[PDB]
Design an enzyme around this catalytic site. Structure first.
Site, PDB file in Angstrom:
ATOM      1  N   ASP A 132     -20.048 -70.551 -62.018  1.00 11.84           N
ATOM      2  CA  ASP A 132     -18.880 -71.610 -61.663  1.00 11.84           C
ATOM      3  C   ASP A 132     -17.614 -70.990 -61.716  1.00 11.84           C
ATOM      4  OD1 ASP A 132     -17.866 -74.301 -60.416  1.00 11.84           O
ATOM      5  OD2 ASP A 132     -16.959 -74.254 -62.420  1.00 11.84           O
ATOM      6  N   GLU A 180     -13.310 -71.680 -61.700  1.00 12.14           N
ATOM      7  CA  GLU A 180     -12.311 -72.580 -61.652  1.00 12.14           C
ATOM      8  C   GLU A 180     -11.107 -71.679 -61.224  1.00 12.14           C
ATOM      9  OE1 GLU A 180     -15.068 -75.287 -62.100  1.00 12.14           O
ATOM     10  OE2 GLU A 180     -13.121 -75.982 -61.081  1.00 12.14           O
ATOM     11  N   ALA A 181     -10.233 -72.344 -60.386  1.00 13.75           N
ATOM     12  CA  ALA A 181      -8.981 -71.561 -59.832  1.00 13.75           C
ATOM     13  C   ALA A 181      -7.822 -72.270 -59.564  1.00 13.75           C
ATOM     14  CB  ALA A 181      -9.812 -70.724 -58.679  1.00 13.75           C
ATOM     15  N   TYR A 227     -17.163 -69.618 -51.572  1.00 14.89           N
ATOM     16  CA  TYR A 227     -16.281 -69.618 -52.436  1.00 14.89           C
ATOM     17  C   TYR A 227     -16.433 -68.639 -53.678  1.00 14.89           C
ATOM     18  CZ  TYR A 227     -12.336 -71.681 -55.038  1.00 14.89           C
ATOM     19  OH  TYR A 227     -11.306 -71.884 -55.721  1.00 14.89           O
ATOM     20  N   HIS A 235     -15.526 -80.305 -63.006  1.00 13.61           N
ATOM     21  CA  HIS A 235     -14.375 -79.323 -62.759  1.00 13.61           C
ATOM     22  C   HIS A 235     -13.764 -78.844 -64.091  1.00 13.61           C
ATOM     23  CE1 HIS A 235     -13.570 -80.568 -58.520  1.00 13.61           C
ATOM     24  NE2 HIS A 235     -14.164 -81.923 -58.900  1.00 13.61           N
ATOM     25  N   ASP A 237     -19.798 -77.992 -64.638  1.00 15.32           N
ATOM     26  CA  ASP A 237     -20.288 -77.681 -63.161  1.00 15.32           C
ATOM     27  C   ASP A 237     -21.586 -76.940 -63.350  1.00 15.32           C
ATOM     28  OD1 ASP A 237     -18.477 -79.547 -62.440  1.00 15.32           O
ATOM     29  OD2 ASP A 237     -17.369 -78.014 -61.248  1.00 15.32           O
TER      30      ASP A 237
HETATM   31 CA   LIG Z   1     -15.646 -76.772 -60.960  1.00 17.74          CA
HETATM   32 CA   LIG Z   2     -17.581 -74.784 -58.356  1.00 17.79          CA
END
Ligand SMILES: [Ca+2]
Ligand SMILES: [Ca+2]
Ligand SMILES: [Ca+2]
Ligand SMILES: [Ca+2]
Lengths: 220, 226
Positions: free
Chosen positions: A14, A16-17, A122, A180, A185
């Site tokens: 996962d 985060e961005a 993504y 998040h 996640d």
């Molecule tokens: Ca996330």
């Molecule tokens: Ca995600």
DNA sequence: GACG
DNA sequence: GACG
């Protein structure tokens, strides 16, 4: 038919961005959780309890200083900000990070398959773009990847929203924990993959594709 | 006190699991590192409540947790306390403690603002000397020769005096927090518990770490190989 | 002690 | 869609 053999380990992933794709985002937090195939091969009620994550796991969670500010949206939901990542001395997505990731991957029995929710749209293209900045050769050019949205569609149909949290609440009847945070996640994602672990493994082995083939999200 | 080696930027909470206790010449089976910037321990808020709530982990943290196949069997007590065993570790394809593991640690540590201090409960008698024998076995130079290390039993002893008890991990935890540790089987569960207690008075714990840090390279190995 |  |  198995296009690349049995995947010997699954790496839940996962990112985060700073924002969503059209913002041309940069990564702020990365988490990997690496599980041997046999941990699924050995994973029941209505609802079943949330599955116990396997005892044997490898985990990496890293906060990353982006090159540009987080969007207001992303900062709120992640609780991260460029300004705070810097205050606390996080390094950028750099050549040393790629060595770290290589060494972490080299500790898993191959072939490995990255598993991410909405990964094809993504996490996979985004990770590709980050790596392409480095020209250290990519440490992921030998690994495989698959999208958990497609996986869980096939499982439920063989057995409506396919967003991480909707699937989790449908299978288990609980809200998930730690939305998040990248580790939160990844956890939630593991739990849905452990729902039907043999059939999920089967699917992943069927659908794994080279990560070297993933097109960057932008830049190219 | 004037600082031995100045301000330690990163605190890395550390825990190892292994096959047994020191007299058995134990081998590492699991390792966790949680790196935090000193700043996240100048940022833990005022505790409100009774009993006092377990503090929130800082948001910005780096975490590494690895399972490690040992070259000898786990003792019954170590199997029971960790839920790990050699047979199982090998079934799940875990690799030995090797040179790549050292490159991974080095990159992890090099991702940190320097200098870093390792923090481990009974670190001076268990985790530090053990980590040293594991690394001495490798043909890779030690990734820890510029890293510092400190034992949290002496920290909390001095912290608690300032405000005859057991100082084992979960005793301090349940004494401060009036509940049982969330997870006492895994290396990550123990780091999280150590982090919680170290967040009890984080201003004083920092003060104390900076005063007591020593090079990890002065840590003597638990046992020789030969 | 207290660490597995 | 669904991902920050
Ligand atoms: Ca996330
Ligand atoms: Ca995600
Ligand atoms: Ca311990
Ligand atoms: Ca422990």
């Amino acid at each position: 038919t198995l296009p690349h053999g049995h995947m010997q380990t699954l790496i839940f992933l996962d990112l985060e961005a700073t924002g969503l794709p059209s913002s041309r985002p940069e990564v702020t937090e990365l988490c990997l959780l690496a599980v041997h195939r046999r941990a699924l091969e050995n994973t029941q009620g209505h609802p079943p309890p949330v599955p116990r994550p396997p005892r044997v796991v490898d985990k990496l969670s890293l906060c990353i200083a982006p090159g540009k500010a987080c969007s207001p949206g992303a900062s709120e939901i992640t609780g991260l900000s460029k300004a705070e990542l810097e205050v606390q001395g996080r390094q950028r997505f750099d050549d040393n990070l790629a060595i770290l990731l290589r060494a972490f991957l080299q500790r898993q029995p191959q072939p490995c398959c990255l598993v991410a929710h909405n990964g094809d749209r993504y996490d996979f293209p985004l990770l590709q773009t980050e790596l392409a900045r480095l020209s250290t050769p990519s440490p992921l050019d030998g690994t495989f990847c698959v999208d958990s949205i497609a996986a869980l569609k096939a499982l439920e149909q063989a057995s409506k929203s396919y967003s991480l949290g909707s699937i989790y609440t449908r299978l288990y009847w609980q809200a998930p924990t730690d939305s998040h945070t990248a580790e939160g996640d990844v956890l939630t994602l593991l739990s849905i993959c452990q729902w039907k672990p043999q059939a999920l493994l089967q699917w992943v082995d069927e659908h794994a594709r080279p990560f070297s083939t993933v097109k960057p999200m932008y830049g190219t």
